[PDB]
Amino acid sequence: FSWGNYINSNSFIAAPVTCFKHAPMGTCWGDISENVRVEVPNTDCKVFWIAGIVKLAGYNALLRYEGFENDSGLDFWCNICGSDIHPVGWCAASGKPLVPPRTIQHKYTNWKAFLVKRLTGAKTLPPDFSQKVSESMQYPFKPCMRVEVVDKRHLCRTRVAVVESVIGGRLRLVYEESEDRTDDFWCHMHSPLIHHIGWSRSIGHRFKGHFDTPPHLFAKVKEVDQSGEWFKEGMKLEAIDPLNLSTICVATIRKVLADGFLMIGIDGSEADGSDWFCYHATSPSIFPVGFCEINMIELTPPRGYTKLPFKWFDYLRETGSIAAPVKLFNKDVPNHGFRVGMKLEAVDLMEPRLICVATVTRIIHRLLRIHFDGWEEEYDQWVDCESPDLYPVGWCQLTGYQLQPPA
């Protein structure tokens, strides 16, 4: 399985790296494009020649050695953030030889002349590109750093986890009181699920050579004024079910915490309080009553609720409750860049260990429907467009993470 062949067999389109602000180089890609030329090794000949970008898919570039024109006989895919890609001028700056592919060595006669003619004015890689690449992959979370994280088996409490590995900004955490042999939690270092040691007590969230994580390293949460009209216990809303990212569910505000966090319960599936999960009020995972109907999204009603189809108006009268007002959910919709059909590499939020060949299949504003290629649609997930659990084609190869293929 190659992303290159997959994308070529089917003329697929990859989300540009630019859609993923949290990924390596997600902020430094603005001048990468088709017909950028680079210096890369000449495999047809230890030495280098010029290649132009025929096709760009996430981090992956389809390159054609200069002098080939429309002949794709030796086009080859590679990772533009990989270690043998250099800007035009790198050989000359290092005193290295530019040597033509054996295949077109006789196609043109005057090579120096030919390179002045082709490269004069050429777009190439930003300067400092290779330093920026290399800074990109230097993550601030280290092994042995302790964090607070949601308890997989008891969502309403945090427990303490320790970073055992970093791969590509993703952390494999291990619970400090492990309850089985292989007792990890995989998440991005910008996950909204991890917090400084002392977070739970500070905010009123329940809780069950290592050192505390420097509090400054955590993703910043948007500041909210919760002192006028706010959420209040018993208000209804819709919420992506944390145990089932395929579904948006009928839900209720169960606790209003400090700093804007909310304990939310899925009606029909609530124990004691142990199933409450914590979303920030600005979370893209909760929506007002009506969101689903107005947008043609399957709303999942409470377990055991028989009067179908579900009607909110009836459920409000029955449970004697009100909708959280729509204004409480206002938030920007970034111009995220994603388009239906777009390929990318996604985390399977039901088994986060796995990162998978995937496609965006619906966009409702900032909300994406993510499909895992080759698998059942039933298991498509709802994910925000700024999720830190989405990545560009090539990210696995770049960081050394194992990629699951389709099907």
Numbering used by the authors: 12 to 56, 61 to 223, 233 to 295, 297 to 432
The authors write:
MBTD1, Malignant Brain Tumor domain-containing protein 1, is one such PcG protein. MBTD1 is a four MBT repeat protein comprising 628 amino acids. The MBT (Malignant Brain Tumor) repeat is a structural motif of ∼100 amino acids that is conserved from C. elegans to humans and exists as tandem repeats.
In the MBTD1 structure, each molecule contains four MBT repeats that exhibit irregular rhomboid architecture. A narrow channel runs through the middle of the structure and is filled with water molecules. Although the four MBT repeats of MBTD1 have similar three-dimensional structures and high sequence identity, only the fourth MBT repeat (MBT4) contains the semi-aromatic cage, which is formed by the loops between the first and second strands and the third and fourth strands of the β- barrel core domain and constitutes the binding site for methyllysine residue, analogous to L3MBTL2. Interestingly, Arg325 from a symmetry related molecule is inserted into the binding pocket, mimicking the methyl-lysine binding in L3MBTL2. The arginine residue 325 is stabilized by a salt bridge with the pocket residue Asp502, and cation-π and van der Waals and interactions with the aromatic cage residues.
